[PDB]
Amino acid sequence: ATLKDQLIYNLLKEEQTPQNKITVVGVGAVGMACAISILMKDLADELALVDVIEDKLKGEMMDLQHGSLFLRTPKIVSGKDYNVTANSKLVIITAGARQQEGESRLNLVQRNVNIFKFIIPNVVKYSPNCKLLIVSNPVDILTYVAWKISGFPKNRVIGSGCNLDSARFRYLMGERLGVHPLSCHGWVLGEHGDSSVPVWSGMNVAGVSLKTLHPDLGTDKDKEQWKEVHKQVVESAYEVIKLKGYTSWAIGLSVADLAESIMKNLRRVHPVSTMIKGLYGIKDDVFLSVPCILGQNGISDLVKVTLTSEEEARLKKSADTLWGIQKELQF
Amino acid sequence: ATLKDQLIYNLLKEEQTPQNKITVVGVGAVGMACAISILMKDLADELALVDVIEDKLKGEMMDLQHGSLFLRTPKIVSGKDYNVTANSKLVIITAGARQQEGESRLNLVQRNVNIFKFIIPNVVKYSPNCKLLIVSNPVDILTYVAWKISGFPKNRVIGSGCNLDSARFRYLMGERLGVHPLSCHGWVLGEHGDSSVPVWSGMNVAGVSLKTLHPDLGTDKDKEQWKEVHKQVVESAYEVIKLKGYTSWAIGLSVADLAESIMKNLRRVHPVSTMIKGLYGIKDDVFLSVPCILGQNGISDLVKVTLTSEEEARLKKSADTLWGIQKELQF
Amino acid sequence: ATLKDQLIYNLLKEEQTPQNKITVVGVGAVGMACAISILMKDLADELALVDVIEDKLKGEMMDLQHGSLFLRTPKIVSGKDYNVTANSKLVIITAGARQQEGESRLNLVQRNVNIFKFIIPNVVKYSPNCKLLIVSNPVDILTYVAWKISGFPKNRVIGSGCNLDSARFRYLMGERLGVHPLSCHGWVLGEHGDSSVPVWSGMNVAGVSLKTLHPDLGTDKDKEQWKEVHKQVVESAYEVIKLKGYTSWAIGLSVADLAESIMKNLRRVHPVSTMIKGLYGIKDDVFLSVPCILGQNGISDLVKVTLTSEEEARLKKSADTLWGIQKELQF
Amino acid sequence: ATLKDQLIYNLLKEEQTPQNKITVVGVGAVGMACAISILMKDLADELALVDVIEDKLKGEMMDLQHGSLFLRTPKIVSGKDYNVTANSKLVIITAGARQQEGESRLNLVQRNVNIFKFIIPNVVKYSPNCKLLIVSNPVDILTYVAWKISGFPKNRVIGSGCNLDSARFRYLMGERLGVHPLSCHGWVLGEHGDSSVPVWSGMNVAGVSLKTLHPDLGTDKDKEQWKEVHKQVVESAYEVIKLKGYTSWAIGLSVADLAESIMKNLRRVHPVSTMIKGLYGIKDDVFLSVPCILGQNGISDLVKVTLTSEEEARLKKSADTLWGIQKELQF
Ligand SMILES: NC(=O)c1ccc[n+]([C@@H]2O[C@H](COP(=O)([O-])OP(=O)(O)OC[C@H]3O[C@@H](n4cnc5c(N)ncnc54)[C@H](O)[C@@H]3O)[C@@H](O)[C@H]2O)c1
Ligand SMILES: NC(=O)c1ccc[n+]([C@@H]2O[C@H](COP(=O)([O-])OP(=O)(O)OC[C@H]3O[C@@H](n4cnc5c(N)ncnc54)[C@H](O)[C@@H]3O)[C@@H](O)[C@H]2O)c1
Ligand SMILES: NC(=O)c1ccc[n+]([C@@H]2O[C@H](COP(=O)([O-])OP(=O)(O)OC[C@H]3O[C@@H](n4cnc5c(N)ncnc54)[C@H](O)[C@@H]3O)[C@@H](O)[C@H]2O)c1
Ligand SMILES: NC(=O)c1ccc[n+]([C@@H]2O[C@H](COP(=O)([O-])OP(=O)(O)OC[C@H]3O[C@@H](n4cnc5c(N)ncnc54)[C@H](O)[C@@H]3O)[C@@H](O)[C@H]2O)c1
Ligand SMILES: O=C1N[C@](c2ccc(N3CCOCC3)cc2)(c2ccsc2)CC(O)=C1Sc1ccccc1Cl
Ligand SMILES: O=C1N[C@](c2ccc(N3CCOCC3)cc2)(c2ccsc2)CC(O)=C1Sc1ccccc1Cl
Ligand SMILES: O=C1N[C@](c2ccc(N3CCOCC3)cc2)(c2ccsc2)CC(O)=C1Sc1ccccc1Cl
Ligand SMILES: O=C1N[C@](c2ccc(N3CCOCC3)cc2)(c2ccsc2)CC(O)=C1Sc1ccccc1Cl
C-alpha cells in the first residue's frame, strides 16, 4: 500500500461545495493586494484567481500557495476558465485596460466595457447567487455596466466608489489633529476620484462637529483651509502614480474591509457606490457613493445623508456627466 | 483660536521612543511583501522603510500610510537617511543589486557585500541593540557578512536561511497527504536554495515518522518517489521567477512569522541560518540553517539534529564551499 | 415615520439565515469559556446558547451582547427552546450533572445519559447536519451516547477527549525544554483522564525524537523522570479543582481550536475522541482518542499511530472498561 | 548530560527585563475577564496576576498556563508579593470589597480605599513608570484615590469610567437601528454608572446627527422614547447582576480595548475618566469621563465636548457629589 494509505485511514471521500469562497478577477497590482489582504484576514475558505495573462496568473497562484503554512485558507486555485470560480460568495473585479496618451476617455471606458462583456457573463454562469464588488475604473460607470450585464438586483452589485477616498481623507485628517484615523470620522461621497464630495457637516471627532466649531470649515474663505484635506486626497493619488507607477496596498486594504462586512454579515456602514436613482434629484440609472450598510446581502440599506444645495448640485452634475457617457456605450 | 486647539486640550507635548519599531531595508517586492505582512499581523508600533531609489521609496510609504484606517500601526516613516530607523527592535534587510552582470566587474556576491558595507554600519549606529534579519542573497554568506561588519553577538544576527525552503516543502507534503501544512512537519536544512538538505527522519504527521512507516523514503528505490518533493521545492522556485519575474508573497509571509516569534518572545523553533561552527565537524565561521529557538534575544538556543552520514556530508560540503568564498572577502 | 426611517432607506427586507452558526449547550464555566474563546476568534456569524437554568442563561447572553462593540459576531441568542439553535454548523455540548455526596460513578453516568436523552434528540431536530462536539464528562462514554441517540455517522460525532491532556502535556514539556508548546510535539491518546496514554515515541522537537536520543524516556529507570510529566498532567487536573473549584480557560481554548479547524475546513490534525472499533484489536462500539483530521465534515480521516504492545494493551483495557459501563446503560 | 542539553545548545542564558508586561490586580470575575481578553488579543509578552486569596490565584494562573499552546503570551506569573509585577508597562486594578446589606455610601468607598492603601504603594515600588488603569468601583473616586497615593502625573492615572457605559449604549442604539455598534456613534460622559450623561448631540451614523433629524432625542416627551436607550443601559447593569450575580465578559472586552490603545500607542479616542478640574466650571480635584486620546503615555489629550447647560449642570452636580466623599476620606 501507499505511504498515504499506511498513515491515514479514510472515513469519507465526499467533498462539499466551498462555503466561504471569494474570487479575484485580474491579478495586477490591485487584484493581488486585495488577494493578500483577504488571505491575511482569514475571510475565505477558498480563493480563486482569474486573468488573461496565463503565465503571470500561475506565478501569482504558486507564490500564494507556497505561503499556506502561514495562512488559514486551505485551497487556492487559478485559471483562464471560470469553472475554478464556481460557488463564490463574493466576486471582486479588478481587470482593466491601460489608458494610452493618444486615447479618449470614451474609448478607454468602452475598452473596459468590452472586457466586462467577457468577464461578467462567465461569473454569473458559475456563481449566479454571488455578490459583485467592482474596483475597475471608472468604478461608478463600470459598476453600472456590471449591474446591466449581470441582470443582478442592485443590492448584489457593489462599487468600490469613495471607500478609498474616505480612507485617505481620514488619514490626512488624523495626521492634522494628531489622532488615529479610526477616531477621525469623515465622509467623501458621490463620484470616485477628482469629482468626489467631502461632507464637511459630518466631519467630527468624538461626535463633536468641526463645522459647528468652525462655521467656515471646508469653505473657500477659511483661514485654516481645511479644504486642503480633500484637495490633498486627490493630489496624493496622482503623486503615488508619479512615484511608483501604481497603487496597491491601500486599495487592497479597503477592499478587504468591505469583503469582511459582506462575508461576515457585519452590517457596518461603508462609503460604496450604489444605485442612486431617486434621490438628490437624480432620475437616471447611475451609481454613486453614499454610506451603505453591508452584509451577506451586499447592500441591504443606505443612509440618507443631509446634503446642502451646493453639495446636491455637485452630485447632479456627476450623475449627468456619468449618464452622458453611459448612453454612448455599445453592449 | 485655531480649530485643533478648540477641539483638543493638550495635557503634555512629551517625545517618546517607539516600543516595538521594525525597519525594512530594500523596498523591492520582497521588502514590500515583508512590510505588508508585518503590518497586517500587528507586530510593530512603527515601521521604517529605507532604499536608495528615492521616488519609489516615497511612493511605497504613502501607499501604506493611506491604509492606516485598516491597520494598527500608527506611524510609518521612510527616507534615504537612517535617522528614520532609530531605536529599532528588529531590522530586516532585503536590499540587493540588480541581477545584471556587466554593470560592474564585481560579481553578484561582491556587489551585495559592498551594499552591506555601508548599510550595516548605518543601522547599527541608530539601532545598536536590534536583531538583524538577513533575507538578501546569498543569504548564508550575507548573514556572515552582516555579522562580521556589525560586531553584534551571534544571537542577534539571523538569516532567513531555509525558512522558505521548509515552508514550500511542507506545502507540498501537505498536498500529497491531504493535510494542512501546519500538521505536516518536515525540515529542510543546510545551505539555502539549490544545495538544501531535506531531513527525512524528521518528517512526520502526529509524531508518526514517515521513514519508519516507509524505509525507502527519500532513497532512489522509492516507488512513490518522495525524493521528488524536495526536487519540486527547487523547481518551483525557478518556475515562479520564470512566470511572474520575482517571488514576494511566500517569502514576505515567512519573514513575518520570524518577526512574530522575535517581537513576541515566543521561543518557537524555526529553520534559520546561524553560525554552525562546532557542529557536524565544522570548524570554520559559517552560517547554515538549523532549527533555532527564536525570541526577544534573537537566536537564544539551537536544536542539535541527528543527521545521517549523507546529510552530514552535504552540510560539510556546503560549509567548505562557503568558507572558500568568505576567506577571500576584503572589508 | 420613525427616526430609523428618517435615517435609513431600505432596499430590501429579505430575512436571512446564519451561514456560520455555533451553538453551545450548557452555560456554565466551561460553556462560557468556549463561547468567549469562539467569539474572540471570529468563528461564527451567530452564537446560540441553551441551558435549563433560565436566569443565568439570560444574564450570560446579555453580558456577551454588551461586548458587541469589540466583537465581530453580529448575533447572540439564547433560550431553553432548541428553535434558537436551528441550522447550527457546530453544536458543543458542555451540559452535565455534578456528582453528589451519596452518589457513585455509575449513578452519575446514567444521570448524564438521561440529560443527553433530552438534549441529543432536540439538537438533531433543528440541526440535522451539524457536527457534535462533546465536552461533558465522562467524555468518551458520552461521545458514544451522543452517537447512539443522534443516529449520526461517526464523522459528525466528536469527543473533545485527549485534546486538553495533550495541551497540558505540551505545556509542561515546553517548561522542561524552554521551548514554546507549539514547537514541543507530544501526543496523549486513548481514554480521557486518569487512564490516558502518552506516546513517548512521537515526542519530538524540530523532528528530532526524544526517545531516540534518550532511550529510557517513558520508563521507571529514567534518571530525569519524564513519566512525571504525564503524571503531573493528571495531578494538575485535580490540583486546579482543589484551588479554584473548576476548570475553564484551558478547556475553552482547546475547544475553540477544534472549532476553528471544523469551521474553516483546515484539515489540521487534533487528538480527539472517535469510534475506535477495528483498531488495536478492539471489537466494541467505543470512542477513544487518536489523531484525527478535522474539517467541514468533522473527522474525515484518522492518523494510524503505530503503538507498542504496552500502549496497545492500555487502549484495549480502556475499551473493555468503557463497554462494561456502556452495556448496562438504559436509554 | 541532561536530555535538554543533548537536544539543545545554548547561546546565552541571560534574560531581559519585561518589555511589554501587563499586570492585573484582583482575580475575580472582572480581573479574569480582562486577563483572557488581553491574552486573546495578544497585547503582552508577559502577564502578572495579583490577589490576596492565594489558592484561587494559583488556580487561575495554572488554568491560563494550560492554554499556552493556543496563546501567544509565553510568560504568565502570579503571586501575593508584588515582585511579580516588576517592570509592568500597564497595571490594571480590579480589586474591590463586596457590597453589603444596609451599608453606608461613605462606608463602602473607605473599605476600598484601605485596599488601595496597600495595593497602590506596592505597584509604584516595582513599576514606578507604569500607567494605572482603575476598574474597581466606585471607579471615579478610586481613580482619584489611586492618583493621590501613587503621586503619578494625572496622564498616567486612567479610570475605566464611562467606557462600559458607552459600549452598552452603542449596542442598544445598534439594535434599534439594525446596524453594527461600530457604526453607531454615541458618547455617555461624566460619572460612571447611575449618574452618567448621554450626549445626545454627538449621536450619529455616518456623520448624520440624530438630534438634528429628531429634536426630541433625549427628552421625556419623545414619542419614540429614545431616552429609554440610556435608561436601558443603567437597567441592564442591575438586571445582569440579578440574573447571574456578577458581570464579566463586557467589562473584560472594554478594558482590553483600552489596553490595546495604550500598549500599541494608537492615539484612539475613548470615553474614560480623567482629572477634570478647570473644565465645565468644575473647581475640584475630580475624575470624570470625557473623550481622551490614549497612547503610550496614557492620556496625552482630551476632546473638548460642547455641552448643553443641562448636561453641564449634571456634570457639576456629580463633581460636587464626588468631592463631598473624597474630602472626607482618610488615607
Ligand atoms: N476603484 C478604486 O478606487 C481604484 C483604485 C486603484 C485602482 N483602481 C483600478 O483597478 C484596476 C486595476 O489596476 P492595476 O491592477 O493597477 O492595473 P493592471 O493593468 O496592472 O491590472 C489589470 C489586469 O486586468 C487583467 N485583465 C485584462 N483583461 C482581462 C480580462 N478580460 N479578464 C481578466 N483579467 C483581465 C490584465 O491582465 C491585468 O493583469 C485599474 O482599472 C485601476 O483603475 C481602482
Ligand atoms: N531569503 C530568501 O529565501 C529569499 C527569497 C527570495 C528572494 N530573496 C532575496 O531578497 C533580495 C531582494 O529581492 P527583491 O525581489 O525585492 O529584489 P529587488 O532588486 O526588487 O529589490 C532590491 C532593493 O534593494 C534596494 N537597494 C539597493 N541597494 C541598496 C542600498 N545600498 N541600500 C538600500 N537599499 C538598496 C534596491 O533599490 C531595490 O529596491 C534578493 O537578493 C533576493 O535574492 C531571498
Ligand atoms: N473533557 C474535558 O477536557 C473537560 C474539561 C473540563 C470539564 N469537562 C466537563 O465539562 C462539564 C461541564 O463543566 P462545568 O464546570 O461547566 O459544569 P457546570 O456545573 O457549570 O454545569 C454545566 C451546565 O450544564 C447545565 N445543564 C444541566 N443540565 C442541562 C440540560 N438538561 N440542558 C442544558 N444545560 C444543562 C447546567 O445548568 C450547568 O450550567 C463537566 O462534566 C466536566 O467534567 C470536560
Ligand atoms: N468600572 C466598571 O465599568 C465596572 C464594571 C463591573 C465591575 N466593576 C468593579 O470591578 C470590581 C471587581 O468586581 P468583581 O466581580 O471581580 O468582584 P469580586 O469581589 O469577585 O473580585 C474582587 C477581587 O479583589 C480581590 N482583592 C480584595 N482585596 C484585595 C487586595 N488587598 N489585594 C488584592 N486583591 C484583592 C479579592 O480577592 C477578589 O478576588 C468591583 O468593585 C466592581 O464594582 C467595575
Ligand atoms: O489611487 C488611485 N490611482 C488611480 C490609478 C491607478 C492605477 C493606474 N495605472 C496606470 C498604469 O498601469 C498601472 C495602473 C493609474 C491610475 C488614479 C490616480 C490618479 S487618477 C487615477 C486610480 C484611482 O482611481 C485612484 S484613487 C483616486 C484617484 C484620483 C483622485 C482621487 C482618488 Cl481617491
Ligand atoms: O524563491 C526564490 N527566488 C530566488 C530569486 C528571487 C528573486 C530574483 N530576482 C530576479 C528579478 O529581479 C527581482 C529579484 C531572482 C531569484 C531564486 C529562484 C531560483 S534561483 C533564486 C531567490 C531564492 O533564493 C528563492 S527561494 C529558493 C531558490 C532556489 C532554490 C530553492 C529555493 Cl527555496
Ligand atoms: O480539568 C479537568 N477537570 C475535571 C473536572 C472539571 C469540573 C468539575 N466540576 C465539579 C465542581 O463543579 C464544577 C465542575 C469536576 C472535575 C476533573 C478534574 C480532576 S478529575 C476531573 C474534568 C476533567 O476531565 C478535566 S481534564 C483531566 C482530568 C483528569 C485527568 C487528566 C485531565 Cl487532562
Ligand atoms: O455592570 C456593572 N455592574 C456593577 C456591579 C458589578 C459587580 C458587582 N458585584 C457585587 C457582588 O459580587 C459580584 C460582583 C456588583 C455590581 C453594577 C450593577 C448595577 S449597579 C453596579 C458595577 C458597575 O459599575 C457596572 S456598570 C453600570 C452600573 C450602573 C449603571 C450603568 C452602568 Cl454602565
Side-chain angles (χ1 to χ4, degrees), chain B residues 99 137 164-165 168 192-194 196 233-234 237-238 241 245-247:
Chain B
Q99 201 202 342
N137 263 323
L164 188 58
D165 313 55
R168 281 176 167 149
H192 163 78
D194 292 347
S196 71
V233 175
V234 181
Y238 286 84
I241 304 301
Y246 55 90
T247 62

Side-chain angles (χ1 to χ4, degrees), chain C residues 25-26 50-54 79-83 85 91 93 95-96 110-126 132 142 145-146 149-150 330-331:
Chain C
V25 181
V50 345
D51 198 295
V52 287
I53 306 169
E54 287 176 290
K80 67 186 195 73
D81 199 333
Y82 284 86
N83 58 19
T85 72
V91 172
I93 297 165
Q110 182 66 66
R111 278 167 75 250
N112 278 346
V113 167
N114 294 347
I115 291 172
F116 275 46
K117 283 194 288 208
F118 184 74
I119 297 173
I120 302 295
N122 270 293
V123 162
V124 336
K125 196 141 61 192
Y126 296 96
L132 282 169
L142 293 172
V145 181
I149 304 167
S150 65
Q330 205 70 249
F331 63 118

Side-chain angles (χ1 to χ4, degrees), chain B residues 83-311:
Chain B
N83 54 3
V84 309
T85 84
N87 304 113
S88 283
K89 285 274 197 73
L90 177 62
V91 175
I92 304 170
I93 294 147
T94 80
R98 22 49 162 93
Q99 201 202 342
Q100 193 73 231
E101 29 191 331
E103 278 161 5
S104 63
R105 282 125 201 158
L106 294 146
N107 58 68
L108 175 64
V109 175
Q110 293 180 328
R111 269 202 290 194
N112 279 14
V113 163
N114 280 11
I115 287 172
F116 272 52
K117 284 210 202 307
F118 60 91
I119 285 180
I120 310 295
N122 279 316
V123 346
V124 308
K125 163 183 165 36
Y126 286 103
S127 297
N129 294 322
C130 75
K131 278 73 72 196
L132 286 169
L133 206 167
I134 313 305
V135 174
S136 317
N137 263 323
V139 64
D140 293 309
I141 290 162
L142 294 181
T143 308
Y144 166 79
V145 160
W147 173 78
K148 204 74 177 66
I149 300 170
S150 68
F152 280 11
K154 296 168 191 172
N155 61 285
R156 283 209 274 122
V157 190
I158 315 96
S160 177
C162 294
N163 200 33
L164 188 58
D165 313 55
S166 299
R168 281 176 167 149
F169 189 87
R170 287 173 80 181
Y171 162 64
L172 296 168
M173 199 196 308
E175 287 286 306
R176 309 261 284 216
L177 303 170
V179 189
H180 193 288
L182 264 177
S183 290
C184 293
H185 307 278
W187 298 79
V188 182
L189 304 180
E191 177 185 355
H192 163 78
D194 292 347
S195 312
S196 71
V197 185
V199 188
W200 307 109
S201 68
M203 291 173 53
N204 78 88
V205 175
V208 180
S209 165
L210 274 49
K211 174 146 261 271
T212 297
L213 265 181
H214 192 59
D216 293 348
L217 179 86
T219 75
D220 290 42
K221 60 263 179 182
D222 187 20
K223 294 87 181 76
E224 300 171 44
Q225 59 204 31
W226 266 83
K227 200 167 189 174
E228 210 67 37
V229 186
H230 176 243
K231 190 154 162 70
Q232 287 179 43
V233 175
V234 181
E235 290 174 315
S236 66
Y238 286 84
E239 193 181 22
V240 175
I241 304 301
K242 182 205 177 302
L243 297 165
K244 67 178 274 201
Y246 55 90
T247 62
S248 60
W249 312 118
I251 178 60
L253 283 172
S254 66
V255 163
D257 187 42
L258 302 176
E260 186 177 4
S261 295
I262 295 160
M263 298 281 85
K264 296 189 195 168
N265 190 53
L266 297 177
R267 301 186 65 82
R268 275 189 299 168
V269 183
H270 297 258
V272 284
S273 181
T274 187
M275 182 179 286
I276 317 293
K277 175 195 161 192
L279 299 78
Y280 317 115
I282 286 148
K283 295 172 188 179
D284 303 306
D285 283 7
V286 288
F287 288 64
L288 294 171
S289 292
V290 288
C292 299
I293 285 92
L294 250 50
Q296 76 198 354
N297 289 317
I299 307 164
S300 58
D301 289 83
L302 61 79
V303 178
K304 274 138 45 179
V305 179
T306 302
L307 297 174
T308 61
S309 297
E310 64 183 344
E311 289 162 353

Side-chain angles (χ1 to χ4, degrees), chain C residues 26-322:
Chain C
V27 87
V30 176
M32 296 315 301
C34 301
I36 193 70
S37 301
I38 282 164
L39 290 171
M40 266 193 270
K41 286 187 81 180
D42 301 346
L43 308 184
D45 69 347
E46 187 165 318
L47 177 73
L49 310 171
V50 345
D51 198 295
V52 287
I53 306 169
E54 287 176 290
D55 288 355
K56 182 151 204 66
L57 179 65
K58 190 185 175 185
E60 289 285 345
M61 179 199 68
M62 288 180 75
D63 200 351
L64 294 179
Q65 282 173 344
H66 297 159
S68 287
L69 183 62
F70 321 100
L71 295 164
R72 300 270 151 154
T73 58
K75 206 170 176 183
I76 301 170
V77 302
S78 75
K80 67 186 195 73
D81 199 333
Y82 284 86
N83 58 19
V84 303
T85 72
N87 201 39
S88 276
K89 291 221 187 319
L90 188 53
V91 172
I92 300 151
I93 297 165
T94 60
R98 43 169 50 72
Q99 178 157 30
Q100 306 292 322
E101 315 295 53
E103 271 203 289
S104 62
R105 193 166 294 276
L106 175 68
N107 227 264
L108 175 71
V109 170
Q110 182 66 66
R111 278 167 75 250
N112 278 346
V113 167
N114 294 347
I115 291 172
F116 275 46
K117 283 194 288 208
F118 184 74
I119 297 173
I120 302 295
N122 270 293
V123 162
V124 336
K125 196 141 61 192
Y126 296 96
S127 302
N129 277 117
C130 75
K131 270 69 67 176
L132 282 169
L133 181 59
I134 185 59
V135 172
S136 324
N137 267 312
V139 60
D140 295 314
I141 285 144
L142 293 172
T143 305
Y144 160 80
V145 181
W147 183 68
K148 207 68 200 164
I149 304 167
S150 65
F152 280 12
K154 37 192 200 186
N155 62 280
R156 296 196 288 116
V157 181
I158 312 182
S160 183
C162 280
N163 200 36
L164 176 60
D165 311 61
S166 301
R168 279 171 177 160
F169 188 89
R170 291 172 71 177
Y171 162 76
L172 291 171
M173 172 180 167
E175 285 290 344
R176 285 220 173 181
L177 293 168
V179 173
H180 199 281
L182 275 164
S183 300
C184 302
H185 304 292
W187 293 81
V188 184
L189 304 182
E191 186 182 352
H192 166 84
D194 302 319
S195 302
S196 72
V197 185
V199 191
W200 307 105
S201 63
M203 288 174 61
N204 70 101
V205 176
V208 3
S209 173
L210 299 171
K211 186 71 170 167
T212 300
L213 64 83
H214 193 93
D216 283 318
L217 190 91
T219 61
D220 301 319
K221 312 87 226 162
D222 188 16
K223 292 169 163 290
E224 290 178 28
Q225 220 93 334
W226 290 70
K227 286 84 277 185
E228 290 317 305
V229 184
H230 175 261
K231 285 168 188 174
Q232 276 156 292
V233 162
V234 171
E235 291 168 26
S236 57
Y238 291 92
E239 192 179 348
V240 174
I241 307 306
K242 318 205 195 84
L243 292 168
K244 66 178 275 194
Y246 62 93
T247 305
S248 58
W249 313 114
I251 182 64
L253 290 168
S254 67
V255 170
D257 192 69
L258 299 181
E260 192 192 356
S261 286
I262 297 164
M263 292 290 129
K264 298 185 70 51
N265 195 36
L266 296 181
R267 298 178 64 79
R268 284 188 298 165
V269 179
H270 304 260
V272 293
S273 197
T274 188
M275 171 69 67
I276 203 174
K277 187 207 309 179
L279 284 173
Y280 317 115
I282 298 166
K283 301 190 183 73
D284 288 300
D285 296 353
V286 150
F287 286 78
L288 291 174
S289 290
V290 296
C292 301
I293 299 175
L294 272 35
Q296 64 189 8
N297 298 291
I299 309 159
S300 48
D301 323 324
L302 308 178
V303 172
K304 285 183 284 171
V305 184
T306 321
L307 303 182
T308 74
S309 313
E310 287 67 41
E311 296 165 336
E312 218 186 299
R314 291 177 67 173
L315 251 66
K316 73 185 76 152
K317 273 282 171 165
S318 289
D320 299 353
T321 285
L322 288 179

